[PDB]
Amino acid sequence: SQTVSFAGKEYELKVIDEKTPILFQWFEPNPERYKKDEVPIVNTKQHPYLDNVTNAARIESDRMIGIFVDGDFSVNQKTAFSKLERDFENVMIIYREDVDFSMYDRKLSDIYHDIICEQRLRTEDKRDEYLLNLLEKELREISKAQDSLISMYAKKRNHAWFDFFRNLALLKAGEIFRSFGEGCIYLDMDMILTGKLGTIYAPDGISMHVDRRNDSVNIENSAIIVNRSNHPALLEGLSFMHSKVDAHPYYDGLGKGVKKYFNFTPLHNYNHFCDFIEFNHPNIIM
């Protein structure tokens, strides 16, 4: 029955039902920062991320709560993570190295070819010789062992490491927990649940957090709702990811794909698109 529209197009509000699992993410650059036997996720008064995750799990007793982690954790840390699963019936630790994301890979060489043709297809003296040389040299230096975009990102230890694999996890969307249903509700660990989510709706089954604090409005990647795996708005984001080797910070492949999917251009109304896309919940403090 029920529809909304944006930029003169109609979209179905689609259900994100009560079995949709919740996913949180923590990627740890420095696992040595924890005491022996503690779970290597920050849990300070300022950033009580682990407590927030467990709080959500206690509140949503009939949903699966996942913790998507990555980093060079010790055996002793793996033990602590395992204890956390044991103390909570509905909590699952998901290590990035155990997930197969290979369906979403692209070869680095393919990416360089594309980047290179495009540079080569430039007017006689608009060509960037400095850039082309560098790109060609970079391409020569790739081994077949290491010729994967995913492998490169998995060795990274910064923010790009986190975002790249968040995007992949949102595509898997529930397949990542391989009871649980097929969408995913992705939340930042600083978000606090104060009650049950219930049934949620989103346009074409996707929504994103909009922060309205400071009397300003900004789309944030901090919470994302998807109703199905491989959502097309996210696959658009995957194309942007596939078109770069080392995307610059704030390239925001994810954001770009979603906006592209709803035809939100730089000339469209930003406030309208925020109202439309927003994930807002009375029982979550975001």
Side-chain angles (χ1 to χ4, degrees):
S1 290
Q2 197 88 92
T3 77
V4 289
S5 67
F6 172 75
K9 179 149 170 202
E10 246 177 32
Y11 297 91
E12 289 198 27
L13 287 179
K14 279 173 177 159
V15 68
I16 276 88
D17 79 14
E18 273 166 42
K19 279 297 176 162
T20 305
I22 294 162
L23 187 66
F24 290 98
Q25 190 178 336
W26 184 258
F27 281 21
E28 177 58 69
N30 300 94
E32 69 272 23
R33 296 191 307 241
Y34 300 87
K35 295 207 281 284
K36 144 185 187 264
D37 295 352
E38 47 178 32
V39 168
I41 288 170
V42 68
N43 205 21
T44 73
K45 171 138 176 81
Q46 183 54 19
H47 312 269
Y49 288 7
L50 186 55
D51 288 332
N52 298 339
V53 173
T54 59
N55 167 72
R58 275 172 258 119
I59 296 188
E60 288 292 339
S61 51
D62 298 300
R63 269 161 143 124
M64 208 63 24
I65 277 76
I67 310 197
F68 179 42
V69 300
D70 195 13
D72 296 315
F73 300 117
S74 66
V75 60
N76 193 265
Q77 280 159 351
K78 292 232 182 71
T79 287
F81 270 126
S82 166
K83 176 168 155 36
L84 194 72
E85 276 179 333
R86 261 220 171 248
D87 297 340
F88 294 93
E89 214 74 58
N90 58 341
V91 169
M92 185 171 176
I93 310 294
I94 302 173
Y95 297 99
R96 195 270 316 154
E97 82 201 336
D98 300 332
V99 185
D100 163 57
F101 287 116
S102 59
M103 62 285 296
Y104 307 121
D105 209 354
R106 187 174 196 207
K107 267 136 161 195
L108 295 175
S109 37
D110 293 334
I111 302 168
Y112 278 108
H113 297 129
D114 280 351
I115 289 162
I116 294 164
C117 295
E118 173 269 323
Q119 295 293 323
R120 245 110 84 151
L121 309 182
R122 296 275 198 49
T123 62
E124 291 183 347
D125 289 347
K126 292 179 183 179
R127 293 182 183 173
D128 197 327
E129 288 297 332
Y130 178 77
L131 186 57
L132 265 157
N133 287 310
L134 176 63
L135 288 161
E136 269 152 19
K137 163 168 160 286
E138 281 177 23
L139 169 54
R140 288 187 310 266
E141 279 163 342
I142 299 167
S143 65
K144 289 183 181 174
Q146 73 182 11
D147 186 10
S148 154
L149 184 72
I150 296 175
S151 313
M152 169 189 144
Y153 276 89
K155 312 258 94 209
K156 281 170 174 271
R157 284 295 176 270
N158 65 323
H159 287 109
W161 172 41
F162 189 94
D163 300 326
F164 176 95
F165 291 97
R166 181 196 53 214
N167 294 4
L168 303 201
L170 296 165
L171 287 157
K172 222 122 168 101
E175 281 174 26
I176 202 163
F177 295 80
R178 293 182 184 175
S179 48
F180 47 80
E182 46 178 77
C184 179
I185 293 163
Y186 176 92
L187 299 184
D188 199 274
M189 290 195 183
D190 88 339
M191 300 193 167
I192 295 168
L193 261 85
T194 61
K196 279 179 156 267
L197 308 189
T199 301
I200 294 170
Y201 298 81
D204 222 306
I206 185 155
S207 270
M208 310 179 71
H209 176 225
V210 173
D211 178 24
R212 310 176 170 281
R213 283 167 189 293
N214 293 104
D215 201 70
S216 275
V217 197
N218 291 331
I219 289 163
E220 293 301 322
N221 293 332
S222 51
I224 306 233
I225 267 83
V226 292
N227 78 322
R228 55 183 170 290
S229 93
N230 299 306
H231 193 287
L234 310 173
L235 286 166
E236 292 273 33
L238 186 62
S239 300
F240 292 107
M241 285 166 78
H242 283 173
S243 85
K244 297 300 186 271
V245 179
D246 207 341
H248 297 162
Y250 295 117
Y251 176 65
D252 189 23
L254 166 63
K256 270 168 171 63
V258 173
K259 287 158 187 187
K260 169 154 202 281
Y261 178 84
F262 288 112
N263 184 50
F264 175 80
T265 80
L267 300 160
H268 277 82
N269 192 302
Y270 189 82
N271 281 317
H272 284 171
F273 182 70
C274 289
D275 295 342
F276 171 84
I277 202 75
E278 200 173 26
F279 175 44
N280 211 314
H281 209 285
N283 294 335
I284 301 174
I285 299 161
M286 313 195 205

